[PDB]
Design a protein around this ligand. Sequence first.
Ligand SMILES: NC(=O)c1ccc[n+]([C@@H]2O[C@H](COP(=O)([O-])OP(=O)(O)OC[C@H]3O[C@@H](n4cnc5c(N)ncnc54)[C@H](O)[C@@H]3O)[C@@H](O)[C@H]2O)c1
Ligand SMILES: Cc1nc2ccccc2c2oc(C(=O)N3CCCCC3)cc12
Ligand SMILES: [Cl-]
Ligand SMILES: [Cl-]
Ligand SMILES: [Cl-]
Ligand SMILES: [Cl-]
Ligand SMILES: [Yb+3]
Ligand SMILES: [Yb+3]
Lengths: 494, 494, 494, 494
Amino acid sequence: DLPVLLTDLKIQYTKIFINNEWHDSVSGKKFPVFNPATEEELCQVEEGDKEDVDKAVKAARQAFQIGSPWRTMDASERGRLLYKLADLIERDRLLLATMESMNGGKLYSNAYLNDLAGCIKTLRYCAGWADKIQGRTIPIDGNFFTYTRHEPIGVCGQIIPWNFPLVMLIWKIGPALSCGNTVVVKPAEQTPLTALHVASLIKEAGFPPGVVNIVPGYGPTAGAAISSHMDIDKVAFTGSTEVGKLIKEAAGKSNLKRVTLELGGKSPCIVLADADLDNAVEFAHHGVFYHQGQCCIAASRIFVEESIYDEFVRRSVERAKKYILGNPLTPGVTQGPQIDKEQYDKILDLIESGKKEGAKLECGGGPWGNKGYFVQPTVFSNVTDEMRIAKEEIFGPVQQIMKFKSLDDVIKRANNTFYGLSAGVFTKDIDKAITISSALQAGTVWVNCYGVVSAQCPFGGFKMSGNGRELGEYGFHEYTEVKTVTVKISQKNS
Amino acid sequence: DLPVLLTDLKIQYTKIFINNEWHDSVSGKKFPVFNPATEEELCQVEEGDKEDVDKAVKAARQAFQIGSPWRTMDASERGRLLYKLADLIERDRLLLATMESMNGGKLYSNAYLNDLAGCIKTLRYCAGWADKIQGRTIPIDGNFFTYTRHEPIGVCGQIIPWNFPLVMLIWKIGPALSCGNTVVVKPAEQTPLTALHVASLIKEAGFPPGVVNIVPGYGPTAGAAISSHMDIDKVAFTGSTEVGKLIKEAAGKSNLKRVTLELGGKSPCIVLADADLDNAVEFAHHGVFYHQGQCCIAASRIFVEESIYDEFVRRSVERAKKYILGNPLTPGVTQGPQIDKEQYDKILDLIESGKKEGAKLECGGGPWGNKGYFVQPTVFSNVTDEMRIAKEEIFGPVQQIMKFKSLDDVIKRANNTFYGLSAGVFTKDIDKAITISSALQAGTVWVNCYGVVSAQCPFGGFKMSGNGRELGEYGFHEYTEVKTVTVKISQKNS
Amino acid sequence: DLPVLLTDLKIQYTKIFINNEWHDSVSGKKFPVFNPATEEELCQVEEGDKEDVDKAVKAARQAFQIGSPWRTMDASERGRLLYKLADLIERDRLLLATMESMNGGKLYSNAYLNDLAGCIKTLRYCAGWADKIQGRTIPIDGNFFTYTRHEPIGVCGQIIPWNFPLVMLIWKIGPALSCGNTVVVKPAEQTPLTALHVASLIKEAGFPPGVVNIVPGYGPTAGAAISSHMDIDKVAFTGSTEVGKLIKEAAGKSNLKRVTLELGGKSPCIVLADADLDNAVEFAHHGVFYHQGQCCIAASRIFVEESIYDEFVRRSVERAKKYILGNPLTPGVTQGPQIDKEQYDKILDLIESGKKEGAKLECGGGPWGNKGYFVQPTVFSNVTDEMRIAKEEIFGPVQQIMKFKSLDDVIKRANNTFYGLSAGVFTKDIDKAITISSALQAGTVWVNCYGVVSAQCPFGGFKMSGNGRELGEYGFHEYTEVKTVTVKISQKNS
Amino acid sequence: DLPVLLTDLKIQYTKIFINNEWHDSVSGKKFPVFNPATEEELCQVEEGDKEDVDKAVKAARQAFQIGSPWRTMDASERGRLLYKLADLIERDRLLLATMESMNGGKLYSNAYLNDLAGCIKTLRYCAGWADKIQGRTIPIDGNFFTYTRHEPIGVCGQIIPWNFPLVMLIWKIGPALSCGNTVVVKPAEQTPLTALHVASLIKEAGFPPGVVNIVPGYGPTAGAAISSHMDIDKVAFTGSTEVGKLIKEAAGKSNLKRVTLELGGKSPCIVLADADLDNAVEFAHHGVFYHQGQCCIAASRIFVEESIYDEFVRRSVERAKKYILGNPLTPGVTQGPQIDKEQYDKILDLIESGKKEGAKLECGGGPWGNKGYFVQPTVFSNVTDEMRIAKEEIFGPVQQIMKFKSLDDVIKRANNTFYGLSAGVFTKDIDKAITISSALQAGTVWVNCYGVVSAQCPFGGFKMSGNGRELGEYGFHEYTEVKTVTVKISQKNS
Ligand SMILES: NC(=O)c1ccc[n+]([C@@H]2O[C@H](COP(=O)([O-])OP(=O)(O)OC[C@H]3O[C@@H](n4cnc5c(N)ncnc54)[C@H](O)[C@@H]3O)[C@@H](O)[C@H]2O)c1
Ligand SMILES: Cc1nc2ccccc2c2oc(C(=O)N3CCCCC3)cc12
Ligand SMILES: [Cl-]
Ligand SMILES: [Cl-]
Ligand SMILES: [Cl-]
Ligand SMILES: [Cl-]
Ligand SMILES: [Yb+3]
Ligand SMILES: [Yb+3]
């Protein structure tokens, strides 16, 4: 069942968080924060800029110094702190899910049952790794004793998008903190509020000051200050391809800091004639429409074998026509608004390109309502590979359905993109499932499902959908720096 | 193609191998070695007993001493020696395959193309791990530096069966030597000859003396001397369930040495109605008949869904009726003899139990020829779970075919055995393949194939088919002894 | 600080725990449980025997069936249950530490601050591994897809000693449960009480019924029923060498179940002339006297370089003369009783052998008090390697101090034992610390400390001190069974 | 001993290597290649540019296609090919060492005994990993089967410097090929010759065409074509900080290809008063002077405790005054030339800055000879942290020696650099060795030695000395791309 907050949500935490204390901006400037379902201002937040990032980095650098509490405490106690933070987020789950929905335009049902549960589970997963991060002893040639330390990197700047503010906050700080790093987090200008509430819980849990610093503010200002900072050792980012390129360039020009990126995609589904048809239609539908299409792994190209193409298209339209748009906090509402004017304009412009370029509009195709950034759920059939809605990430509720008959050809078409975040394969054939998934150039391939993401699985893109992996055992590698120590000895023995 | 030796095979190495020198038995006694296809003596071999094992253990213990060449050389040089040994076996492949066939009653085609290639590949695989065996550095609670050494165990006694003399020799010494152990090997009394030739190549490759010692001789004498020896750290064994129990008991009574066992099985195949029928028939046929049925992973219970049962039975009989029995060295011969009188008697007695207990004899069912331990390839249909040929490992060319209709029931029937070495599943359904293989209590489960064994895969039994794993990354664990070293330090840092 | 229970301890849980319900013994028989400090009966407990073990195994087998709640729940939820159990033990820490002290004769200060903290930390460590136990995907030769499952083994019988009842209970059930096994636990007849209280918390935490079963009772009865049971897949044991041999023999005779043993030791310390002398004296003192000497890793042979031998002996005697014997619940008491009459008699008989065989009695040497199994802390100097107190594990407060001058010789003397659980090295020289620790045949080697044991470190013996490892990453291997699944595919790609 | 080539070296391979065939440049242009010891031209080589890189990438992309020989062959056969290549380089060791010395200005003794042995050993190490690169099976939440493939990335562009042409060629292609990638290699314009000879051996070994392509040519032309290429998946680079920044920027602007860099350093040694003084002087001397100082790990800041500073300085000068300069092919010659005019000018300009800024010139300080880019081995004492020779990587035979008395302060001074490739610690104190090495921000820390690099150890920089690691188990991660495959199943079991 779906419990709700029984009193009005009151916003309390609006300031910059550095050394576990609340700071005004150095400039004194604040910026507004809006509800995307009403277009109304929720509150003002301190606007961080380069001078505020500079204060946060100095705090994170001090907290990382040899001999500091965060460097010297047991790894198991790092894990304890993360498990306590997860307990506190669970305590404030109603508050946090409500704030996430109100600020992010996110269905409250999903915010409470999915985002908040993913936050809690991911933190608990990360807490468990803290004292299980291990180096090696190595049988080097010669009379030496050689071991490795998988040390924390140091100060990690982490730039977060607006589509999953809480989940992405925990995906970033969970592994970084578990490995022993300190962090300077820059939440999306649209959605700083839940991150600042989590900062209050980081204080309450007892993390040493400066281990986690949060600087709300804008991208070209605070974000660029992070990417180009001379004392940040690593930057992690999730968001647009364009900013990703900006970050890697600024990183190259400044101090060659380590960079990992996750940059969205144009993820394809291949539905073979032998697929469980109803299962494939349902998973591909949710794959493209989840969170109003504002998901990096959106299943935005669905290739269906000709023998079943028309049935797939009809059943997808039937399912797309069943949505209730409105305020994401009202029960029964099944689609909320897009985040803001920029994304809203982008979706409408791409929908129009689909009409003009000759796609078949099966349903939707325009805006909705008198307030809020709402877009009708839209289905396009007979899409071809050269159309804009086939090539560009839309980040809206816009589904593309294509036909194929040659399996060889559709794999090339699925791979013919600079993106490569995820893919789906729907078939009952063992051999096809293994060989197709091996052939797709995508970081996660789902077979007979879609959008299944768990803390135990590494997640990240092939090609221009990004570099590096998050979560799972493998993701923790990107938050460590390996040191080899080689000691001369009189005689070694195996 | 299949090259052959162009001169008569001459036997040269017949003595006990200790400290890289050839020893007569302490007793002076020798024992005969026979060709199972002719029942004629090939040569005499020095008979090792407890006093000879005692000399070999003293040599292996000396070679393992701290400061010795084998303990102090680079791990990478241990690997070099193993790769050189593989090169030398490849050089003597014609000789070794011929000797293996003549002594072991093994088809020369298989001996040359399969056993010898598996020997060479497994050695090269093991050589690659030598300098990649690594311990850990561990973020222990408190102000300590903790690391682990994955040391060699020490002197490993290794008792080998007669069905795959060379392959089992390399499966044992490859990992043991790669990890840095020293070994005392006791080949089967039936088949000492190829092991002694390999000992000549261990000398030629340059292994330090005492690293590999080979003591030919009998089970209750030399083998029991190994299992009960007070200075052997580990015993590894492949052979009968009965001896396996004898070894573990003697190990418990003496010095609590580590024991790993592989003890054969009664491995089942489940063939669902949707299986590729011809593929399933061919793999199950070879699965049961390979090397005259003298294989631990023999597919000796084949459960076939009723809808296709009669077709499966007919096609299996058709395939079983196509064999040519004779001397395993003559080209075109496709089935050789059983190893000796004991195995021959055991197979005939079990075949007769099948007739008496009411199985349907589809073909074969008796002995063959005027010399050699030959048994007609035999197929039984309508087998039921209480018959002796359903319960006891036969180790002969005797195939059992059963029907089922309830998938739930046939999994229980497949699991209703104290054995658990391997199983096969034949289906085109993705879900069935994953769920059935997860549900079978067997160490290796093949899907739409059978008998696929490679150096990269751990191999071993569930339940009374044995303990521990051989080969793959996981197998190397059983040839190391973990030491934790914990050092007090003034202050640790992550 | 050291909080205490503010009301009398009342014993509640005295029955057999099977399927999360409390059972009387099948026989109806109960046995008494005593306080070793007073020799007074505390309560009666249901006496489990073979028929009760048979009920527990049937319950554990049912809970392990494919499709059961414990097999199908998320690994992460297995970890959740373990973290909840740790929370509950932390809640009942005062109760549990008091009961442990009263039943086990264990100083309350240590019981509360060390045993209970080790229980809580080890459980939390084990909970973190549950969803991080992973198999492999393997690049096998040929056109196949090969992966491994690291499955739970199944029903694990776990026999626990009386010296660390709670800690050993958690060391056994923590890893077993984290890996997904079900367990049948047989606590020491002397000390069943804390295990039965933990069983009440296993119920409260919500573990599915039959996942943990606890059968109090005696060794030759309930314990032998476990070792010889035909449907227990693995037995783990900590206790005497003699029973260890009995278990491995019964395991070999019955169903070849997997066995791991930890069997105590005769652990040596080597103190070089350059050692921090006061540091070495203090660590070696606690190493031998901890928990009245009833510790497997007791530092029961201390070899000290001649130049500093007399100073080491004097300082050790000074420290040994500072103890206060009495009831382990009274504050300020620094040594409690031995567990029972058998251990008490054994210690006194070995002390007398030391006197007769010519050791120098520096202090102690006899019993103490009018009630309770108390032994004066005893120090022997000028011990030689042939004396009984040099060879046999004493398990009492009896310290042996020896001199050496040849480092080569003292390493041989340190290694000249069938035991091999642990060792200590005290030196300021880098090279000596690495080379000596590499040369000692012991499972844990401490450098400039002793007795440092943490959940992150594998723990176990070389030689006759046992087989296998507990805790750390490596310990989890012994609670999994590896299954290789190899799937035929049309074409593989790297 | 040191064998030599008995006939004149004849240069044969001067063309671009693509698809295992020799190509002229698309332009027709060639460039000269010089001997740095004589300043004389050795031969002309085809000059590759963007059009040639484009041909090589197309070939490498074709060789990486699903279904190709390199994608479908057994991993073990990838390893076979690498071991065969190592055999062939060993066969041509005299030829290759001579060519390396003549083209690279590298002492023949080192070229034959060190570079060529490192090439052979590193290849054999890499060959062993090929079929031991494994993914995971993961106990994900929900009813799913999840596994990972550690796939090759794809086409890897690899830009090589002139100081270790062969060793760096093998460090790049060894791991890349072992993991299954295809490569486009751009050797230094100064030193293309040995790489082209190795290309002839790649053909001879039987690597499929297009797996290894080598495009000799210049940095701003062929190198920039690689860094900015839209179909190269990863670029690896070793060389200057400045080019490293250029590569990462071009990578960010083009296709966000993965980048790893190794960029030299300013590596410090800390010599405590208790150090073995002669051992520290010898290791620090070779650490700074190896290969005429043209080593990334040059020990270019040596901090010595005041009590022993003057003795360290004298002994270092004594050792530096014992060199024989001349042609690196003549026996007895112990220092060769610098690579070219640019490096030569840079060294002399930095030597002069040392004089002007007030360092104490102990020996050397100017050029040498009438031909060749020779520099006298130069020692500076009383260096301070603000001088250019303290801050800038010199890449010449120029040693800096500094004093300290505060250990806290000297660690800060050691860390006060944007570099971070390596460091050395010289002390006999266990605690100091562990705590100092933990505190240094450097990728490899040697204790009581220096410059010990082996194929089993990961190697790479902290901070602006680069990102990622090469060699060892950890280095192989950077040549794989992780794919998560998650399959819906009816019910999972642990
Ligand atoms: N890490 C090392 O081992 C190493 C090696 C060589 C030089 N260095 C440092 O660099 C300094 C300058 O030496 P250098 O000029 O010969 O080094 P460099 O970085 O310019 O040359 C190294 C490699 O990079 C190539 N390259 C040059 N410009 C390029 C560009 N725009 N794009 C892509 N590739 C390009 C070169 O052709 C060569 O293959 C040296 O003095 C030394 O301090 C370090
Ligand atoms: C034997 C040897 N001794 C050395 C002593 C002092 C300094 C450097 C040394 C060295 O470098 C190498 C070497 O091949 N490198 C390439 C890889 C990066 C490191 C340099 C070998 C080698
Ligand atoms: Cl992985
Ligand atoms: Cl495995
Ligand atoms: Cl370990
Ligand atoms: Cl590592
Ligand atoms: Yb369906
Ligand atoms: Yb010296």
